[PDB]
Amino acid sequence: PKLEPFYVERYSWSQLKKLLADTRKYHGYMMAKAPHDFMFVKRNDPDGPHSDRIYYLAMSGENRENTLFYSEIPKTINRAAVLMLSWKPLLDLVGIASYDYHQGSGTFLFQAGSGIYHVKDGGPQGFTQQPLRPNLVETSCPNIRMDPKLCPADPDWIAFIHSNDIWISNIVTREERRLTYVHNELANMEEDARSAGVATFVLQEEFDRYSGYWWCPKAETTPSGGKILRILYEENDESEVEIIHVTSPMLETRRADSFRYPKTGTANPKVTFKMSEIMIDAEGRIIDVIDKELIQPFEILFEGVEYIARAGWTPEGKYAWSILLDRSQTRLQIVLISPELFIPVEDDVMERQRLIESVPDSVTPLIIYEETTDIWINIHDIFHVFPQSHEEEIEFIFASECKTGFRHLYKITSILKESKYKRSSGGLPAPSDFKCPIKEEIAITSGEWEVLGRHGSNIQVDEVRRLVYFEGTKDSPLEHHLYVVSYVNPGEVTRLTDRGYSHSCCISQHCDFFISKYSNQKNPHCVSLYKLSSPEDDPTCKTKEFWATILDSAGPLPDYTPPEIFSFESTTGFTLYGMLYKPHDLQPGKKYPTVLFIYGGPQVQLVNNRFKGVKYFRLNTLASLGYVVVVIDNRGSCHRGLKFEGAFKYKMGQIEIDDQVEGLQYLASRYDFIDLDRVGIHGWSYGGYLSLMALMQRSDIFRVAIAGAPVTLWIFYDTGYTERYMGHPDQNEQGYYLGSVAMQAEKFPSEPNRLLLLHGFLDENVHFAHTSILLSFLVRAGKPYDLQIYPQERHSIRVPESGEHYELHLLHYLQENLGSRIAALKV
Amino acid sequence: PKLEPFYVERYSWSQLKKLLADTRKYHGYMMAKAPHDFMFVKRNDPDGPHSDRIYYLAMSGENRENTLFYSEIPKTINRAAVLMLSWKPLLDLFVGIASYDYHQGSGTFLFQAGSGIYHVKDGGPQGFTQQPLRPNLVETSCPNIRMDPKLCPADPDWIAFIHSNDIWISNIVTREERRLTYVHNELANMEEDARSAGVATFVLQEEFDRYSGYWWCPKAETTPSGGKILRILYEENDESEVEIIHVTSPMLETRRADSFRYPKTGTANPKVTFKMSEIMIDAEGRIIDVIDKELIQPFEILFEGVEYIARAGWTPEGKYAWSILLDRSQTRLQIVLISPELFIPVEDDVMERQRLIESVPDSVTPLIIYEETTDIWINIHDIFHVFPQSHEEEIEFIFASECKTGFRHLYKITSILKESKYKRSSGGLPAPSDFKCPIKEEIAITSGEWEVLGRHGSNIQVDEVRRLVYFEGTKDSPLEHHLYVVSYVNPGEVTRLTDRGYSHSCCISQHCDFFISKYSNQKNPHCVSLYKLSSPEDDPTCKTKEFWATILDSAGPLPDYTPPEIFSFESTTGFTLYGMLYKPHDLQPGKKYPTVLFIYGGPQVQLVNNRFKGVKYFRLNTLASLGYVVVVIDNRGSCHRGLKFEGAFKYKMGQIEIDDQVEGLQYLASRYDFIDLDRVGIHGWSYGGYLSLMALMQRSDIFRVAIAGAPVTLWIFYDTGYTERYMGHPDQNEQGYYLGSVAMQAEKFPSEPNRLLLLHGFLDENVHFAHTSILLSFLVRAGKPYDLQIYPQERHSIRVPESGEHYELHLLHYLQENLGSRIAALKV
């Protein structure tokens, strides 16, 4: 019950710089983009030795660019040996982030730097044995072209965004044309605040939607012998959105860039759907372009809707679908929208009033699903629509947390009958006039575990065997695994991935292969191909066989000791998991200083069975200097269901440190080497927020707090995020005050060397103001602080030298104010 | 010999806060504006006991408003005793007055007090009040704040003021109000609407001390009808081509930035010109019409090469309007007379206007009555006196200049106003020298290795009866300002009127029979006294003074304030360099103490002189009480030592100043062994913060810690008026700008922490935060450590009390933890 304090070696600034540079020079080989965005194409060669060819994006090695590759999948393997697939470069010598494909032609389409290029492979053209030459799509457009997409109905056409307007371009006939005329590149953003086909700030940052336009997958054939291509697009008007200024990166100018930030409780962009009808003749040449708008306003047809979360088309191009949220993000709706709801844009009220009357009353919005929750809707990428058997019906799979409190798959069948509302009557539609009735709603899955549907996780639907492959947490919340089940008569759930690793998978479109990117705490990332088989007596049953390795793991790195995943039964009635790094060369009869690394906000899990030696390598480096490192997933973090996540609704900042302290005390009572008299805390963003709350609330536990890019004041943060978790400010005056660390400056320590603020000066999410206004109050209240600014940096640290300076200063600060001999001398 | 190191008392944050709060809570009497802006008015009462009444502005006591007071000057005194004048309040109150106007003939005061503009009467034909007067609000229909009020000297019923960057006039009797210029629109954006009238732009306020941009003509021209014509000369600026930068808005919740016009060095200054507002008033005192008038030819033609309008006004009879004009490089000054006949009505119609051009004769011309040049720089000042016109062909005036000898001295000049060789009807342009007047005479009223003072209130008073000129100067010592007097007709020897042992700040009665002096010295706080002037009967030129009364009595030696010792040393540069030394309180024998060099070191200031330093630099004493040696040195470049001494760093800022500081620092160490050179800190604000960074960067051997407040890290970001005066245009001094800019030399900073501290007001308009942020950006590239403090609700100066307390607290804790204390020496 005494123990001696260990003190870390007190290196100088120059020495720590060298220590970090030398330890960073070890790794870096494994800082390269692992194979992803896989696609399987069949050879169809009876005599040839390969069944499929697989295309994928990958970084060849370290400083080389991200580009298209391919490997060859054999019909049979040597089951004695282990087949390592070799990577064939698809392209001849600007990274590629994503690519499009068209099965019927073999056309690839992709952006590489400023250019948009295309090649052909695996179509009627056949299969290349040599790298292809990327063919530049020529243009007359002055500025950069973003968001290229192939037209699935016709692979000669592409679309793209230029200066916030939608353009199309033919890659054969070389024709180029502008579809929307909503933005003027010459005017100021104060005057011209409109755009088309592009998601606004909040939708990119807070809902992971980047594109804002969608090709209709089928072409209506014209009497003339040509066709009609279509593009559904969103049109945003940001005029009423507040304009803030953020410091321009060219610091010599002494100027600030304006941008549209919908801070909480203020106006989001004004949104609507539009349709671009494009009449092409028999020669593949544009006859006309008719821009079309909704027959009535968006606010009438889609009452209560703020956000267009997701959108697309049905497989046959009959309807266009959309997933719509209300402002509070407690009501989700899936709505079908017929192209017949759109009429041409017409100035003349005589011509226009006629066009309104030409559309039938039966043609209506069709809300094919609706759900509510008293916690919040979490948007995801799962949504699959089966072919239409009957005109009166539509059949689909969707996921939801709303029923059970865990995300599970549901097969739903809705009825498409005429609306009680009729347009000729000249009234407004009632709240429930467009609701379709639910004929059927089978639960495909259930339990105390979630189906995953974000960050690449999705489903794959086998419509022959009538199965659905999906990722989930059924076996453990610490490991993602691939599963498969019947969607017709949902029996039991067959796990397809091996335990002991967490997996990130995708399934061949043909449903006879899958790939898994897997790792665990001890073993780095690894990518392997697996073949799927049916026992002849029962096609529902699924077994897998290892076929080949795509990327082989590095194996245990020299000097990386991984942590131990622990857990504890909390007083809150929840198992809370954690990671523990023991100090290297652990001296008996001595107690070491502790660093708590934290995030603790929603939509993130720091603790799981994945390799932490690439991202969180410096947690290990801290352990090598003699610091105990702890990481805990408090209440509110993901993969534990909606109830666990909802613990802090309206109450951010109030519960998170209670969990972190409980787990910190669990470890102390068990392991006597943890010195509770010298505990530091450090995080970024929500972690920086919680680090400030820690020092403010619990100065008894935490000696030092190093706050990364703190949210000090929730009124300054955007609509999409802070309203989802904390509601509208007028409906939660208490929670905003208590959740805002800037309002509680007097509660900070009146002794120095305990508070360190870090911030990227040019930050667009967590504006520097959060820090500057906190400082303003700390200065009023006579409180001490230390400050580091990264002047050429936004939220993340992209410039190498800044990242080195962060690491150096952080390691020297912990040393001189927590770990070392001189630290305890100061008191 | 090595001696033992003294370590300062290692107090906690909370304890230092208490220590600082206790040491300033004791005083607070010292933060009160001493009597100033004096004016003597004669009683003219044979039977009455008082000769003059004096009006002045003062702060009654501690946290009270600055307001008008008066005292009574007796005809005789009891020479046995000392008379203390009592302060009679002029005003009823029922805010704060920075300045006032007066009209002798009527008794009319005029002054702004917060939002309002008021007026009272005392000491005219009305007579003299024995009770406080009620200030009479000047009523208005103008929605926004009215600034820069001025009485019309030709008619005290009329005033003028600026409202939303346009000139207005208002009658305080008839209650009429009217706008004269229509140059600005309050509703438009500053990006579009970049014009103004009657207001000095940024650079002229900050770098040339001109705040007003309009000037009443002192006389009215009588009309045939029976009314009159009042005139107002004004400058009109167009800031359209001036660069627009963004400074963070004080309302930090908005996340926004105010636009403002900053003439970055090398770039465009505002486009300027003169204008005249001709105002026809009838016999009733009511406006008939207002004709706005412009220069018959452009400013760039009539005043070739001129960038800045430094100063302007009128001659005493209102015949000519004068102006003092600089070129861009500020190496050529010109005094120019401008007749109202040079101005013509503003007319859209090209036919009507072309006729009006021809109506003005060719003989009517700009008249450059003086011109001078220098290869160092012109320093602008407020001295310029014009005598009445005896002859039509001549003009006679006093002016001061450093251009002849290299020290500022007075000169009586007589110039000839002959017609110009250039003639306007010819339709050509004028040559450079076509408007130069010949100099008939140029007598030197003073000379020597010392300067006449003409800035910050220092001026001259001209006795036109006895033909004398009173002035402030450094003749006796560069450490003491003194009042002197001399003949301007037959300039003999100068008679010092102030006592030695104090530095003085004086003004002289308009009637030249009294003067007042605000004086102090290193041991004694500030004191304001009245002195009577007398002639011997045999010789009016000779002047003697007699003490008459005290206006503000000194507080006497403060409790706990030990003042410093002024020292000096012969520099290797061939200059005497003066300094100030604070010894540690309770000086132990055989021990060596940590030293703090407090510095400014830039141009136009002198830190070392014989004045009381216990108000503003009180906390230098507080540093001495904790056991720090404190040093302050005036290196080359600082003022009151002539132009050559000041010129030392032309094109070379940053290169020479630390050599002088180190030399004096080593003089003191070789003399006093209690200075520990192993623990020397440096601290300054603005140019001081700049030099603090240079000190650490250049001489890391000498300076352990550098604490830089609002540093100029990069001279290309600073304004036209200042940096071009001292460093020239960037393209003509690529070497000096690079070497003078600390941000371009970040690699030369220490690679070891606890040595560099940056302090900055986040909302600073002069030295924009970018100086710091861009320096940091380079320090981060080069892997260098720094400590940073930001005062988010603060501009260049610290106005908010809490911010000032946090500066003092953090500064004291920093020096403690990284220089002075026990723990400090362990950290290395």
Ligand SMILES: *C(=O)C(CC)(CC)C(=O)Nc1cccc(CN2CCc3cc4c(cc3C2)OCO4)c1
């Ligand atoms: C700081 O923590 C933060 C919020 C105060 C600043 C932006 C933040 O949330 N940062 C952050 C950084 C990296 C990754 C994430 C997680 N990500 C947030 C947005 C998001 C949006 C959608 C989603 C999942 C995420 C997760 O699924 C659908 O939309 C957060």
Ligand SMILES: *C(=O)C(CC)(CC)C(=O)Nc1cccc(CN2CCc3cc4c(cc3C2)OCO4)c1
């Ligand atoms: C920092 O030192 C500084 C320059 C980098 C920032 C503004 C600066 O010069 N500061 C400063 C603060 C207080 C007082 C002065 C001196 N003052 C400057 C302007 C000036 C203008 C005229 C003058 C005398 C001065 C002196 O006489 C005529 O015009 C400077």
Ligand SMILES: CCC1(CC)C(=O)N(c2cccc(CN3CCc4cc5c(cc4C3)OCO5)c2)C1=O
């Ligand atoms: C952005 C989202 C997310 C979680 C998905 C998150 O939040 N972070 C996040 C935040 C801060 C820091 C780091 C990496 N850090 C680990 C801590 C540390 C500690 C050191 C050091 C470097 C580093 C690097 O040098 C010395 O001591 C990662 C994420 O990613």
Ligand SMILES: CCC1(CC)C(=O)N(c2cccc(CN3CCc4cc5c(cc4C3)OCO5)c2)C1=O
């Ligand atoms: C603005 C122009 C001028 C010269 C007329 C100048 O330049 N300054 C100027 C600059 C910096 C600081 C101070 C006052 N300081 C003195 C140093 C000091 C040192 C302390 C402390 C407070 C202070 C206050 O607390 C602890 O240790 C004054 C001028 O004014």
Ligand SMILES: [Cl-]
């Ligand atoms: Cl089906």
Ligand SMILES: [Cl-]
């Ligand atoms: Cl005379």
